[PDB]
Each structure stands twice: as C-alpha cells, then as structure tokens.
DNA sequence: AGTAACCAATAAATGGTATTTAAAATGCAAATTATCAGGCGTACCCTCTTTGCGAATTCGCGGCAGCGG
DNA sequence: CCGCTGCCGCGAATTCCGTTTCAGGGTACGCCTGATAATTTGCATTTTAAATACCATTTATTGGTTACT
C-alpha cells in the first residue's frame, strides 16, 4: 500500500531498535495467519 | 479398615513485553579473464549499361490542359 | 483570335470461409585495437544450534486430619 518497502534496519530504528524483535514479530504474524480460520479466502489464490 | 474441602502452600501453568549472542548465510560490488566489433589496405588492365519488359487489351467519367478562330 | 481535342486523375457491394507463415541477390582478404561481456572476490543484512532478561495470570502440589467401615 506504500510506495516502497523499508528494510529491517529502518523498521527497527523507527519502531523499536531491536532487530531480532522484528524477526519475532514476523514469526508471530506468520503463525497467526497460518491459523486455518483466517487463511480461508487466501486459499482461493492457491494455483498462483 | 477410612471420612473432608478446611486454608496455606507449592512452584508450575501459560503467553506474553525485550538488549543480547555471533555465526552462519545472503546478498552485495569489484578484478580478470575471453571475444566481439571496427578501420585500414590491396598498384597489369578494365570506362553510359544496366534496365523495367506489364502495380499489364478495363471502362466510364471528369477536367485540366494545348491549338484556333 | 476564347473554339476543340488529349492527356491525366479518380472510382467499381457485403459479411464469413480456405490457405502453402512459404521461397528468391551470386561480391575478399588479412591486421592491430579498444570494447564489451564475460568470469573471478568481499560486505552488507538476515537468520543464528539457540542463549538470553522480565512481566504475566492459572493449576500443581497441597498443610495436612477429624470423624468413623
């Protein structure tokens, strides 16, 4: 939704300096969206 | 051959807030080889000559042209 | 001296369908040189067996005894 992607370092220095914390945030987000309830519609974009 | 839920207690039940760890891996921009792409030159003598052959027997119509009182 | 010939332009139904994606020019050669396009290393960011440093509310063990087949 935004023009460019900001790398891990920029996100860390903006929100919370910790680098591995961003890694844990992404891990938890992936874990949540892998929960079968939320992903149901996205499966329809399965073949691509 | 054995009743309790009394009131403390014990840490285990979690899933959540982070500065670390350095190793790895992953990308990144150099050096350093191959090969490709241009330029030049050639000294017996040689001199209009090749074409199109016909976007191919249309036809009907129009009009802008040269000759002419 | 304002008439007619002769040039050159311009135009000619509608949809589908089909099909061979296809061939034909007849002229040289060997140097230097720069000019890219290949190929070779290191450094940024992930991701790191995990290791690590605090908050957290919810069972677990629990403190066992007073009644009693």
From Swiss-Prot:
User: In which residue ranges does the UniProt entry place its DNA-binding region annotation?
Assistant: 8-27
Q: Where is this region: Sigma-70 factor domain-4?
A: 1-35
Q: Which domain of life is it from?
A: Bacteria
Instruction: Extract the ranges annotated as region (Interaction with anti-sigma factors).
Output: 19-34
Where is this gene product found?
A: Cytoplasm
Q: What does this chain do?
A: Sigma factors are initiation factors that promote the attachment of RNA polymerase to specific initiation sites and are then released. This sigma factor is the primary sigma factor during exponential growth. Preferentially transcribes genes associated with fast growth, such as ribosomal operons, other protein-synthesis related genes, rRNA- and tRNA-encoding genes and prfB.
Domain remark in the UniProt entry:
Contains 4 domains, connected by flexible linkers. In the active conformation, the domains are in an extended conformation, each making extensive interactions with the RNA polymerase catalytic core. In the autoinhibited state, sigma-70 factor domain-1 packs closely together with sigma-70 factor domains-2 and -4, contrary to the extended conformation that is seen when the protein is part of the RNA polymerase holoenzyme.
Tell me the protein family, please.
Belongs to the sigma-70 factor family. RpoD/SigA subfamily.
State the oligomer form and interacting partners.
Interacts transiently with the RNA polymerase catalytic core formed by RpoA, RpoB, RpoC and RpoZ (2 alpha, 1 beta, 1 beta' and 1 omega subunit) to form the RNA polymerase holoenzyme that can initiate transcription. Identified in a complex containing RpoD, the RNA polymerase subunits RpoA, RpoB and RpoZ, CRP and DNA. Interacts with Rsd; this prevents interaction with the RNA polymerase catalytic core and with promoter DNA, and as a consequence, promotes transcription from promoters that require alternative sigma factors. (Microbial infection) Interacts with Escherichia phage lambda antitermination protein Q.
Name used for this protein in its record: RNA polymerase sigma factor RpoD
The gene behind this protein is rpoD
Within the intact protein, the region shown is: 566 to 613 of 613
């Amino acid at each position: 939704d935004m023009n460019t992607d900001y790398t891990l370092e920029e996100v860390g220095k903006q929100f919370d300096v910790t680098r591995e914390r961003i890694r844990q945030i992404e891990a938890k987000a992936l874990r949540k969206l892998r929960h079968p309830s939320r992903s149901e519609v996205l499966r329809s974009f399965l073949d691509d």
